[PDB]
Each structure stands twice: as structure tokens, then as C-alpha cells.
């Protein structure tokens, strides 16, 4: 394999991710001279996971880090390994790392890392991660919008043991991204990117770069030498949000996750809750992440986890009397877990300490289904029992959420303790 011949980027070229750039500044410092860290035992991560929705500059930042450190950048895409013949995947992972070490210090980027990190190909990856010497100035960055799908072996210490969340940009972030992608473009005097930032809720960087291109097409179509405000207004429409009653439901869903995870004894600590459309900081997402601290999980831990996953839906049903599609992913994950308890873990009553999996009769298929349904239904009703018992808290957390949108650190811990002290 042969390093990217693409155009070098820096952080100059990345808008609306000042938090991410902050954390990555050390990695740039490391790459520029690892010997400053090495000399005093400052141990950097070997793997850094970038998490966010597509088109949010995950790949961009990886490249910005390499250009900023003026180091080679290897771009691989996870979806290139799936579908490969027997062994070809692992041999490419081998080669990748052999090239990385020959060109160290360097960045190795693996896009769509979920594509490989859901056997041989991933096992080879894990051995390479642990096989290489951080001190040689090698850092592997990976991107995913599906971190819930990842093998927890990937996130073990000594691997991708740090991650950074790249969120969609708000109005101020959108404006900046507009300015970046308009730098070398000829704008009319009447163009106001502020109004365009305001009128593009939900748009990510990729969409905004596109909108800018659509705007340029509109000018060029008419043979014009400057892009007008009308061209930007018009372009938005070519590429085409949340109601205050939908905001409410989303808030109740997220609060529901939070309340149930707090009450349930083996609940996952709640560090942040958020009602940003697709922020991956929300707890709703978090609850779908693979267990990275432990290696064993107990039946009661799973039932507690399952009950937390169904908290979103429990809160909607209790409060609104009906349910939306919001909980589809929660339903799917909860079902997966229960099927796994029954068919792999030997955690059903009736089915016994047996691996079922298809290898078995309709008669067993049927008991499996009954058993899986029982677990999920029982956890769901437990969730609602909890919601109802802690309705006032649920209501309180919603109220703040509607106001603040995202609650994160020491502040969140004040609120939860006030509320469940």
C-alpha cells in the first residue's frame, strides 16, 4: 500500500469542532516529536476512535492531524476488508502495519471501522495494535458512526482506549463551515452566511459543502461571476427538523433512559444526557455501547441493562399513552440481548445450560421465542414501574433538558443526586 497523495489539510480547514481539535493538539505535538514524551514516560494512546454521524469531518480531523504534524497519512476503509477471499483481509492488515512502521511517525486511519470490528481480519488487527511500539510515533485513528456495533476488544486499554465525539454543528458551527468552504469562492456583497447558518438546521459539514456547490452551480448556470444570496437560498431547497411536541417526546425518552439507569442497581453511570437530534453523547446512544471495562456479565446485570434500554419507550408510553418509532433501535438491541441470554448464555429457565443455534426443532424454536419474549416484556414492565414511581424526577429532568439540551459533567451529578438523594 502507498500513502495518501491527497491534498494536505490542517485544523485551519476544520470548522465547528473546537473541542475535538483541543484534545487532538497533543497528538499533533506527539507526532511532531515523540521524543519529548518518550523521554519522560508520557504514554500516548495507540488508538483514537472518532465518533459521530457521517459528514461531520471525522476523516477531515484525522487528515488535519497528519497535515498539522506534517506526517504521512494512510487512509484505509473498513468496508474494503469485508467480502474478501480467505486470508486476504489479514494479509492486508499485516501489510498496512508493516508500511506504517517503515514510514513512522505516521497516522493510520481506518474509516468505517465497524465494518471490520463487529474473525481473522479483526483478530489480525488486534495483534497489530498490541504488536506495535507507540514510542515509534505511530497513532491509529478510526472513525465510526456505529460504535455500538464494535467489538469491545477494540476499546480495551492499549488499543482504541480514547475516543472523541464529533457532533453536528449548531448555528455558529454551521456559519464557520460555510466560511471555510467559501474562502476561495466569489460571493456577492448581499450574501449573509449567518442567515444561511440559521436556515440550515440539521445540516452537517458535508451537506453545507454541498449546499455551497449547489449555489455555485446556480450562478454558473446563469453565467454569473458572483454567488448571490438568492443562489444560497435556492440551493438549500434543492438539497432538502423537530417540532416542540417532538422535542418533548425525545426529552422524555432520553430522561427515561436516565431515570431507569439510575434506579436499576447495575445501571451504567450516567455522565451525559442530550436531546440533540443525533449527538452521540446522549445516553440513548451510550447505552448501546459495548462493555469495555469488564469481561464477564451476570444475568442480573443484563436484565438491568435491558430494562435501561427500554426506559426511553417506557417513559413515552407512561407519559403520552402511546409510543413512537424512536425506540426501534432499543427494541432491536434489547431483543438481541435476550436471544443471547436464552440461546448462548444458558440464562433461561426452561431451556437450560445449552447452546441453541439453526440447529434445532420448531418445538424448541417456539420455546426460545416464548422465553425471549418473557425477558423483554418483564424488563419493559419493570421499566414502566420505575418511570411511574419516579415520575416527578422524570418530569424535572425533562424540564432542564428542554432548557439546556445537553447536561454533561459535575452539573449532571448535582442534578441526579438532588433528584435521587
Find all residues with CB under 8 Å of 168, minimum gap 6, and list them: 52, 53, 56, 202, 203, 204, 276, 277, 278, 279
Q: Considering only residues 373, 388, 389, 414, which one is a binding residue for a second copy as defined by CB under 8 A? A: 373
User: Would the annotation count 15 as a binding residue?
Assistant: yes
Residues in contact with ligand ADP by CB under 6 A are 14-17, 52, 54-60, 143, 177, 180, 205-206, 209
Structure-block grid coordinates of residue 266: 447495575
- Residue (59 or 262) nearer to ligand ADP, CB: 59
Structure-block grid coordinates of residue 369: 421465542
Closest residue by Cα to residue 287 from 332, 343, 242:
332
Least distance to Zn ion from the beta carbon of 412, Å? 16
Q: Which of 68, 112, 254, 317 is catalytic?
A: 254
Q: Interacting stretch for a second copy, rule CB under 8 A, among 21-29, 63-71, 397-405, 409-417?
A: 21-29
Asked if 186 touches a second copy (CB under 8 A), the answer is yes
Distance CA 409, CA 421 (A): 18
Distance CA 210, CA 214 (A): 6
- Number of Cβ within 10 Å of residue 418's Cβ equals 10
**Alpha carbon of 276 to those of 138, 169, 354, 404: distances in Å?**
34, 10, 43, 10
Asked if 362 touches a second copy (CB under 8 A), the answer is yes
**Alpha carbon of 134 to those of 117, 140, 151, 224, 262: distances in Å?**
21, 10, 22, 53, 38
Least distance to Zn ion from the beta carbon of 251, Å? 12
Closest residue by Cα to residue 93 from 134, 148, 145, 131:
131
- Residue (164 or 259) nearer to ligand ADP, CB: 164
Residue 205 site contact among Zn ion, a second copy, ligand ADP, none (CB < 5 to 8 Å, cut-off depends on kind) = ligand ADP
- Residue (55 or 67) nearer to ligand ADP, CB: 55
68 is catalytic: no
**Alpha carbon of 234 to those of 86, 100, 204: distances in Å?**
51, 46, 18
Closest residue by Cα to residue 287 from 118, 113, 145, 148:
148
Least distance to a second copy from the beta carbon of 120, Å? 11
Asked if 152 touches a second copy (CB under 8 A), the answer is yes
User: Would the annotation count 330 as a binding residue?
Assistant: yes
Residue 284 site contact among Mg ion, Zn ion, ligand ADP, none (CB < 5 to 8 Å, cut-off depends on kind) = Zn ion
CA atoms within 13 A on the CB side of 71: 32
Q: Considering only residues 8, 12, 33, 54, which one is a binding residue for Mg ion as defined by CB under 5 A? A: 54
User: Would the annotation count 10 as a binding residue?
Assistant: no
Asked if 131 touches a second copy (CB under 8 A), the answer is yes
User: Would the annotation count 209 as a binding residue?
Assistant: yes
In the range 279-298, which residues lie near a second copy by CB under 8 A? 294-298
Structure-block grid coordinates of residue 149: 456495533
E strand residue ranges, 52-200 = 73-77, 106-111, 138-144, 162-165
Q: Interacting stretch for Zn ion, rule CB under 5 A, among 86-94, 133-141, 169-177, 325-333?
A: 325-333
Beta strand pairing call for 406-407 and 273-274: antiparallel
Q: Give me the 255-294 binding string for Mg ion, x by CB under 5 A, dash otherwise.
A: ----------------------------------------
User: Would the annotation count 60 as a binding residue?
Assistant: yes
- Residue (15 or 137) nearer to ligand ADP, CB: 15
Catalytic residue ranges: 254
Which residues participate in the annotated binding site? 15, 55-60, 181, 209, 253, 257, 330
Chain contacts with Zn ion (rule: CB under 5 A): 284, 312, 330
Indicate the annotated binding residues for Zn(2+).
253, 257, 330
Amino acid at each position: 500500500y502507498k500513502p495518501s497523495g491527497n491534498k494536505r489539510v490542517t485544523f485551519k480547514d476544520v470548522g465547528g469542532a473546537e473541542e475535538a481539535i483541543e484534545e487532538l493538539k497533543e497528538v499533533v505535538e506527539f507526532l511532531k516529536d515523540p521524543s519529548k514524551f518518550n523521554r519522560i514516560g508520557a504514554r500516548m494512546p495507540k488508538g483514537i476512535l472518532l465518533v459521530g454521524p457521517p459528514g461531520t469531518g471525522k476523516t477531515l480531523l484525522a487528515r488535519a492531524v497528519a497535515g498539522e504534524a506534517n506526517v504521512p497519512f494512510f487512509h484505509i476503509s473498513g468496508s474494503d476488508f469485508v467480502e474478501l477471499f480467505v486470508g486476504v483481509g489479514a494479509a492486508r492488515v499485516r501489510d498496512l502495519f508493516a508500511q506504517a512502521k517503515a514510514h513512522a511517525p505516521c497516522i493510520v486511519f481506518i474509516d468505517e471501522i465497524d465494518a471490520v470490528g463487529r474473525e481473522q481480519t479483526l483478530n489480525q488487527l488486534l495483534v497489530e495494535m498490541d504488536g506495535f511500539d507507540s514510542k515509534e510515533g505511530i497513532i491509529v485513528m478510526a472513525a465510526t458512526n456505529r460504535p455500538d456495533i464494535l467489538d469491545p476488544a477494540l476499546l480495551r486499554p492499549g488499543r482504541f482506549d480514547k475516543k472523541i465525539v464529533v457532533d453536528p454543528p449548531d448555528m455558529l458551527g454551521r456559519k464557520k463551515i460555510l466560511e471555510i468552504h467559501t474562502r476561495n469562492k466569489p460571493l456577492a456583497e448581499d450574501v449573509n452566511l449567518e442567515i444561511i447558518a440559521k436556515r440550515t438546521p440539521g445540516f452537517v459539514g458535508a451537506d453545507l459543502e454541498n449546499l455551497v456547490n449547489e449555489a455555485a452551480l446556480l450562478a454558473a448556470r446563469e453565467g454569473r461571476d458572483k454567488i448571490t444570496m438568492k443562489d444560497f437560498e435556492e440551493a438549500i431547497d434543492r438539497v432538502i427538523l423537530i417540532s416542540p411536541a417532538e422535542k418533548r417526546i425525545i426529552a422524555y425518552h432520553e430522561a427515561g433512559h436516565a431515570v431507569v439507569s439510575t434506579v436499576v442497581p447495575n445501571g451504567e453511570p450516567v455522565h451525559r444526557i442530550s436531546i440533540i437530534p443525533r449527538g452521540y453523547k446522549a445516553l440513548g446512544y451510550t447505552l448501546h455501547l459495548p462493555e469495555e471495562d469488564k469481561y464477564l456479565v451476570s444475568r442480573n446485570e443484563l436484565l438491568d441493562k435491558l430494562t435501561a434500554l427500554l426506559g426511553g419507550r417506557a417513559a413515552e408510553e407512561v407519559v403520552f399513552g402511546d409510543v413512537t418509532s424512536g425506540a426501534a433501535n432499543d427494541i432491536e438491541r434489547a431483543t438481541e440481548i435476550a436471544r443471547n441470554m436464552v440461546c448462548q448464555l444458558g440464562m433461561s429457565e426452561e431451556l437450560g445450560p445449552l447452546a441453541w443455534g439453526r440447529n434445532y426443532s420448531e418445538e424448541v424454536a417456539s420455546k426460545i421465542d416464548e422465553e425471549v419474549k418473557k425477558i423483554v416484556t418483564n424488563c419493559y414492565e419493570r421499566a414502566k414501574e420505575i418511570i411511574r414511581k419516579y415520575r416527578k424526577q422524570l418530569d424535572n429532568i425533562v424540564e432542564i433538558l428542554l432548557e439546556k439540551e445537553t447536561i454533561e459533567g459535575d452539573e449532571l451529578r448535582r442534578i441526579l443526586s438532588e433528584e435521587f438523594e
